[PDB]
Amino acid sequence: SVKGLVAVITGGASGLGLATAERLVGQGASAVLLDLPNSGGEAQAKKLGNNCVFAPADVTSEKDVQTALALAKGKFGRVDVAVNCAGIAVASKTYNLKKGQTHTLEDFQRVLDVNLMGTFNVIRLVAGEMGQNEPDQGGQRGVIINTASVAAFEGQVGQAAYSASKGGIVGMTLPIARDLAPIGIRVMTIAPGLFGTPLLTSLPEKVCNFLASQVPFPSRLGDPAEYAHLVQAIIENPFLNGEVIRLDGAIRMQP
Amino acid sequence: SVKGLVAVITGGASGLGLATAERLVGQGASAVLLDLPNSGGEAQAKKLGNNCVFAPADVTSEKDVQTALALAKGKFGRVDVAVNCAGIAVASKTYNLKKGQTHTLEDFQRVLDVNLMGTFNVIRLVAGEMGQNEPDQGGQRGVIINTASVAAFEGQVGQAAYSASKGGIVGMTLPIARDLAPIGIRVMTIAPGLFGTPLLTSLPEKVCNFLASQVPFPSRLGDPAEYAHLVQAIIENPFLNGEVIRLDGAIRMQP
Amino acid sequence: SVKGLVAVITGGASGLGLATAERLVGQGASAVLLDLPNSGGEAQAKKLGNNCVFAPADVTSEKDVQTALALAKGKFGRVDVAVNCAGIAVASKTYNLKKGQTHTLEDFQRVLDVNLMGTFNVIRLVAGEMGQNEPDQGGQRGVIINTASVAAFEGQVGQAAYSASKGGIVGMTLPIARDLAPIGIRVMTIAPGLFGTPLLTSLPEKVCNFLASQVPFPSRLGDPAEYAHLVQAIIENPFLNGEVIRLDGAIRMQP
Amino acid sequence: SVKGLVAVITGGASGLGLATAERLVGQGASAVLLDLPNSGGEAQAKKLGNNCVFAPADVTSEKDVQTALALAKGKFGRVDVAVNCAGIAVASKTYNLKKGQTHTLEDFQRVLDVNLMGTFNVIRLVAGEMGQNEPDQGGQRGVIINTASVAAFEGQVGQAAYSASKGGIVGMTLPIARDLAPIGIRVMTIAPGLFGTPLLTSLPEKVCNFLASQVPFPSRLGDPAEYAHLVQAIIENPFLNGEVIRLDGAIRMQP
Amino acid sequence: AATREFIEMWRLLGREVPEHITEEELKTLMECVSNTAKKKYLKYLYTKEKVKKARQIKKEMKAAAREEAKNIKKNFLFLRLWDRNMDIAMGWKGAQAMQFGQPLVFDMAYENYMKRKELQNTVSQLLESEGWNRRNVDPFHIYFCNLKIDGALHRELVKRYQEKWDKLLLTSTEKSHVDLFPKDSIIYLTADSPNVMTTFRHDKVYVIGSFVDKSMQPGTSLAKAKRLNLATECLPLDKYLQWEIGNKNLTLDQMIRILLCLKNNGNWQEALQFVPKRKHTGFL
RNA sequence: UAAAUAUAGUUUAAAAACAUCAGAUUGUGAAUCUGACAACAGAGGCUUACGACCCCUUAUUUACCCCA
Ligand SMILES: *O[C@H]1[C@@H](O)[C@H](n2cnc3c(=O)[nH]c(N)nc32)O[C@@H]1COP(=O)(O)OP(=O)(O)OP(=O)(O)O
Ligand SMILES: C[S@@+](CC[C@H](N)C(=O)[O-])C[C@H]1O[C@@H](n2cnc3c(N)ncnc32)[C@H](O)[C@@H]1O
DSSP states (O other): OOOOOEEEEEEESSHHHHHHHHHHHHOOEEEEEOTTTTHHHHHHHHHHHHEEEEOOOTTOHHHHHHHHHHHHHHHHSSEEEEEOOOOOOOBBBBEEEEEEEOOOHHHHHHHHIIIIIHHHHHHHHHHHHHHTSOOOTTSSSEEEEEEOOGGGTOOOOHHHHHHHHHHHHHHHHHHHHHHHHTTTTTEEEEEEBOOOOOOHHHHOOOHHHHHHHHHSSSSSBBBBHHHHHHHHHHOOOOTOOOOEEEEEESSOOOO | OTTOOEEEEEEEEEEEHHHHHHHHHHTTTEEEEEEOTTTTHHHHHHHHHHHEEEOOOOOOOOHHHHHHHHHHHHHOOOHHHHEEEOOOOOOBBEEEETTTTOHHHHHHHHHHHHIIHHHHHHHHHHHHHHHSSOOOTOOEEEEEEOOGGGGGTSSOOBBHHHHHHHHHHHHHHHHHHHTTTTTTTTEEEEEHHHHHHHHHTTOOOOOOOOOHHHHHSSSSSSSSHHHHHHHHHHHTTTTTEEEEESSSOOOOOOO | TOOOOTEEEEETHHHHHHHHHHHHHHTTTTEEEOOOOOOOOHHHHHHHHHTTEEEEEETTOHHHHHHHHHHHHHHHOOOOEEOOOOOOOOOOOSTTTTEEEEOOOHHHHHHHHHIIIIHHHHHHHHHHHHHSSSSOOOOOOEEEEEEEOGTTTTTOOTBHHHHHHOOOOOOOHHHHHHTTTTTTEEEEEEEEEEOOHHHHHTTTTTHHHHHHTTTSSSSSSSSSHHHHHHHHHHHHOTOOSSSSSSSSSSSSOOE | TTTEEEEEEEETTSSSHHHHHHHHHHTOOOEEEOOOTOOOOOHHHHHHHHHHHEEEEOTTOOOHHHHHHHHHHHHHOOOEEEEEEEOOOOOSSSSSSSTTTTTOOOHHHHHIIIIIHHHHHHHHHHHHHHHOOOOOTSOOOEEEEEEGGGTTTTTOTTTTHHHHHHHHHHHHHHHHHHTTTTTTEEEEEEEEESBBBHHHHOOOHHHHHHHTTTTTSOOOBOHHHHHHHHHHHHHTTTTTOOOOOEEESSSSOOO | OHHHHHHHHHHHHOOOOOOOOOHHHHHHHHHHHHHHHHHHHHHHHHHHHHHHHHHHHHHHHHHHHHHHHHHHHHOSSSSOOHHHHHHHHHHHHHHHHHSSSSSSEEOOGGGGGGGHHHHHHHHHHHHHHHHHHHSSSSEEEEEEESSOTTSHHHHHHHHHHHTTHHHSSEEEEESSSHHHHGGGGGGOOOOOOOOOOOOTTTTSEEEOOOOSSOOTTTTTHHHHHHTTOOOEEEEEEHHHEOOSSSSSSSOOHHHHHHHHHHHHHHOHHHHHGGGGGGGGGEEE
């Protein structure tokens, strides 16, 4: 069970992070919402009740994450689960010959920083926090769950930066799992497909509804609650390690 | 929830099948144990209580599976979940130059028949049974879960036949998921690593201890209960479709 | 170089096999065309000249392949390369709810037998033949190249049997590579996508033209000559082993 | 045929880049060696003859790459092939509980910048240069070949940063291939295993010799010449697109 | 030489001498400068050939028993290649250890103080030590320091390891440990150290003296560890064990096994389980 | 100072058992085969021989407290 577990959820003020927080807190876990200061995570933490707190942090910055992790230690005493849900995208083509536009390197950097470098920054710092835990009966100290995308495998046009960052998370899941295996920390990656996240619902109705219809079954956008369910399943199963689980409803992204 | 679901579990008299049956029946599902007549399946069905029955069938035989499926319809009225856990394994080298030994074609055939052709035989026949179900609120009629192995990805020396059969299940998961998507049947594949199945626990203590040590974390053989847990998670999660989940504790099989 | 190599090409009377034979014979290799008696391979062998012979064999039959391999040993004195190109497909849905139409088990068996069991039959028998070779300077005795498909990864609707067989070839590439590594035989798999073979011409003109257009670049059907080129590249490259190369022009099959 | 092609080879002053340059120049291509000013690439360019020039550039810097590409246009008139071979690594564990060591964020950044961000920087800029080419008979303007590693799939302990960067290249191969498919540029990725590169030789001699022995066949370190051969094969083959080819001699990395 | 004829008269007297002596061992008979020393050497060869005979007799007894057994006389997941696969697995761990593992130093600067007898025993002990390190879950990165290339100890190591010597996943160098590591992080282990080892430190390099002094020279390890200003530590044998008989200077194999389980987050009790039981009468 | 005491992988016994090393692609007794290593603290004596008997050195333990 996940009763009495402390989860540090990054990007927990919205989207898949908030869904994870809602479910975990409902199941009797304590959550730390690690999001940007302006993300309105304070309201979400207040909504979830006493067993949820807001830690304002940028995942790219070591100082911010350290302060946030310290807040978790102060409030709840330990960290058991880290869920990396913080993530941005840019939709830019590498090069379009007609109008002669080149993908700006700054946009590529910014996506890498948040998605890849931010995830790693959290991992390396939470591993320290989780290391301080006494092993349970199974010798487990913590679970780290990262969010890639299906873009990591089949990226659409204009998802080069996004695919690179998600490809990096998929790449480094196994090395990190092997790294932390002696300590007793499980590293797992979820690769969501098309979810009803704020980013997707912002898109034009024609585009969203078509993408939903292109999912084999169910022919709808991923409910964030389903992401939360898979997170809980991974936390509960003490033999899931070093694997990427595609939560996409069997969709492959067309060119 | 899995309360009130009817699962047809193939190879359910032992190993990962029995573990799945135990968990599902405990959670208030009905199970049909579909195994060979000579398996101790009747005792297992009697042990599990009223909500479990034994259907003697060879999975390679169409007649046998049809009779078994009919028994499920008779007893429980419907079929909601199919779990394919039936399997055999063979350790033969493709060619041994020193001893002048060639892999027997009959060995290759018989492994393919049970693992690959047996799984497909069940799938195509249960899809008919599941097709007759009224869609739920989400439009789902059934879930089909297949068991591959990590041999499908990293097969050791002497696992050519086994890897071929498990490779086939991994291959055809997505096509079948796309086939059954209109009907509203989810097809999922689990790829277990080293589990405390009867064939592993039979080994010398020194060999078992080595196999346990090979798994990064946890450094133990997979408890079949863990397999059962992942099965339940897949059944409960509406949005898991057309995917292989590696349940291996982050192990890659060395030559 | 492939000058003076003997290639046993399976299904060499047509399609990708014939293309491989044409190229290899042109580069100064000797080829054995291993195809069915009715395949018209005799005309192809006569056309290719003295350095090509026709061996009538069914790949599923051990006796047939043995006789064919013996013919190769008799004529050319050795076997250096085996290319498995023989294959059939059947386009049948797993289950059609509307029509109540179920995939025939016999159809599934027949596809498995030719594609998977036929490939393995050739491999295990040619490994014996290749084993008898004296190692070259690099310790290499032979190269075995198998043909899977992109169906192994992204199978279309109605390609369950085809995907299973191609999944099996992809699965067992690594185990067999590890098996034959002591002997010094390289095992490699090519996964073609949409080639202008007679099989694909057999589709409607509208459908083939659409499939060609769906290839990112180049937006045309795979030229069989390109398959032959990749075969030669694999033979020439000492360090390509235990890998699947997708030759598809960057196409992913949509559901 | 690669006669009269201009290849911009990144990291071409040593390792796999230099091997590629040697082969391509020998086959009648023109090469631009794009490496750091201190890399001693000038000597290599002088050695290779008139058809090879040295362009001092950092791949992370947009200005540097632009100047280097301009040098290529000045000297040779066009760019047909881009080979990305630039690479650094660090061997650092994510977290060492015993030693209380955390992986430095700066180390992670530096590896990502060179491997991932550097590769993308070259791609986006050379795509502009290649875009200016008139299509050949097949509609092809250019080929871009990237170097990942097998670390992208099976990363060892302490390879987290390297695996992340190589994972990113594998991730973004297909999106970029789909991006550039309209303008007829092929994007391909090679994933070398254990090669006789400066990266691998930096390990202890005893560790190198062990890693060599662990390759199934041939049981030796990859000759850089073999990478050059595969590069030429990709350039020659019109239908290789959006794929990662593992050139590893069938090795899978254990932790 | 006269020694060949010399041993003949000793054979007649029946002073526990073996049947035959190889020409190699004749050379070592000349080394002995005393009747008493010769006696101890002949007895060693006497017992050596006796055990060779007994083992052989027990061997062919088993062989004859095995062949008659043969006359009297399925679905597997795995081929039986366990010994092969274990060696590969231990290899992969050894390579990982060489990159990341904690150093542990054997100082080979003691050839001068050892005789031929003690020198073989050191190599025997080193062989066992590396074995326990190899087979461990968390191996030390083993350093052979102050190992001369052409030295007796190097020559003996090469003989026992054969072709495996080159392929061992440990670092052998003629250099000293002070040259390879920071001087502050070197803790020299010796029983003669006033400083007791309180807890195993993962940041420290431990130096173990490759020295089997049957002819006891006390303090030699300490003397080396003082000439170079190194920290010295001794095991808490007095604290945890009720010492009754025997030398407090343990063998190399025992030392490493004590350290290995100390490193692996064991307590001193679990560690001192490797201390010979004949030497103490329980934990206090 | 005096007493016992000293197994260099571990025990037991008055030589074995279990361990160690190298080789092995083992069809699941490899539960094996072929090799390597074999030194009851150390040195020197006596004797027909001995692990007894003498002596020295070092070490351990205990007793003593120093000629109480
Ligand atoms: O002869 C003995 C004795 O007189 C004396 N001694 C030391 N400890 C004790 C003890 O517990 N009880 C008695 N009765 N007598 C004791 O020491 C003499 C031996 O000394 P050595 O000359 O052998 O050695 P020394 O102390 O000179 O050695 P070092 O410390 O200078 O190295
Ligand atoms: C038998 S001792 C060598 C004895 C030598 N006379 C000396 O002064 O160390 C072999 C090695 O094991 C280690 N060792 C043995 N017993 C020890 C103990 N009790 N405490 C610390 N190290 C010990 C030391 O490193 C020593 O060099």
